[PDB]
């Protein structure tokens, strides 16, 4: 018939119009995709963390900030002990009290610039948590056994290994390590997890006694 072909004529070029619209949409969307992208949440987290660190806090020795909208400082000894000491309870936040930086098998590595003690050129250092214990009656600390080891050349074949023991403090966000019982006070380690996650830390290889800095490495969890 003819009327059928008229109806079909209308249908045919409505689909055609839809197709054109689709093509145009794809052009515009393609044009939008070439406007760069959004940002990695890690880059933003770390940037915010760096700003926060540069801003600092009005806390005293043996205090740490609670964080949050209204600044408050509380004791080292009050973080993650089951009682809320912060006005906003942040000292018991599940993220703040992440025990991941002290988990068995955790290892943090990075290249060390030395300033004393060791006359070698920049190589990796790795510190590996080998054991831990968090006493239920004293929860604001996680006691850890760790091992500091150095990357050495294929020719050395006489690697140096230092056994350490210490703690992770939640409020400080600090892994503090010193010589294991009866093991020659050579090295200690101070790692500060201040990049906003449990996966990066600013470490110093220090003298256990003086806390004198022998070298620094930017630690990363591997």
């Amino acid at each position: 018939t003819y009327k059928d072909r008229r109806f079909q004529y209308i249908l045919t070029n409505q689909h055609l119009f839809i197709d054109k619209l689709e093509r145009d949409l794809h052009e515009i969307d393609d044009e939008f995709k070439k406007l760069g992208s959004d940002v990695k949440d890690q880059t933003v987290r770390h940037l915010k963390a760096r700003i926060s660190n540069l801003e600092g806090d009005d806390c005293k020795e043996h205090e740490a900030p609670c964080g949050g909208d209204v600044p408050q400082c509380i004791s080292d000894l009050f973080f993650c002990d089951g009682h809320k000491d912060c006005k906003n309870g942040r000292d018991e936040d599940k993220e703040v009290c992440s025990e991941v930086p002290a988990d068995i098998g955790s290892s943090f590595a990075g290249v060390v610039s030395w300033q004393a003690c060791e006359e070698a050129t920049p190589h990796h250092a790795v510190v590996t948590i080998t054991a831990n214990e968090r006493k239920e009656f004293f929860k604001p600390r996680i006691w850890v056994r760790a091992i500091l080891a150095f990357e050495e050349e294929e020719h050395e074949h006489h690697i140096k290994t230092f056994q350490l023991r210490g703690y992770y403090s939640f409020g400080d966000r600090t892994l503090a390590l010193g010589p294991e019982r009866g093991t020659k006070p050579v090295y200690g380690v101070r790692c500060h997890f201040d990049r906003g996650d449990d996966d990066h830390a600013d470490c110093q290889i220090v003298n256990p006694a003086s806390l004198f800095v022998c070298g620094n490495f930017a630690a990363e969890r591997h």
Binding site: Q14, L21, S37, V44, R50, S113, P122, D202
Partner: protein
Amino acid sequence: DPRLAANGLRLIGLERKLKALKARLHEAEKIDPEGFIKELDARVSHVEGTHCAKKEFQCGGYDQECISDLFVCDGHKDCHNGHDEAEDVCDTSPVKPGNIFSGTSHWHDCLLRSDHVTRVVIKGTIRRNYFKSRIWVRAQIESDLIHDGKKELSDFDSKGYYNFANRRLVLIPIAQDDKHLSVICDFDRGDSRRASCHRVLEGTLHQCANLSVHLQGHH
């Protein structure tokens, strides 16, 4: 035509919408999240400083390794993480010839000029394949001066270099004893489009003017 006509109206609606969205693209281009964050990273990193000596290049952002700036973008991996040869680091577009950076010069020494436009016009680059650590730049420095009631262009030919490590363009006046001051620009805004500059005396690096150029670029 039942409601086929209605559907047709809907289609006109969608056409209209698409037109509007395409129009929104211009305004959408004025927002660069990634670039914004790169800028903030730059500025924060400047406030932080580094533990490296002068003429040294710090590898990562958090990373502790330092390198001589004579080894930056020379074609050899010198950082434990290869950052000294990274693409962002080694980008050569701040001094791509044809670039015209324009900005307002604010004088506070040497000369007694009021605020005025200055252009750094990149005219050429040489990059020796035996020494890629630096790009040797030749450029024209133009200044629009409204000196005596009427406007007058003050331009001079200049030569220098772009150093990748500190992202710095140094241009000293080519054989121009004629009291034309050098220019030093730092591409410290996270991109290759904007730079924080100074008009300086070559011998002493004394800063006579503050100048901030952006690319804009097309006369």
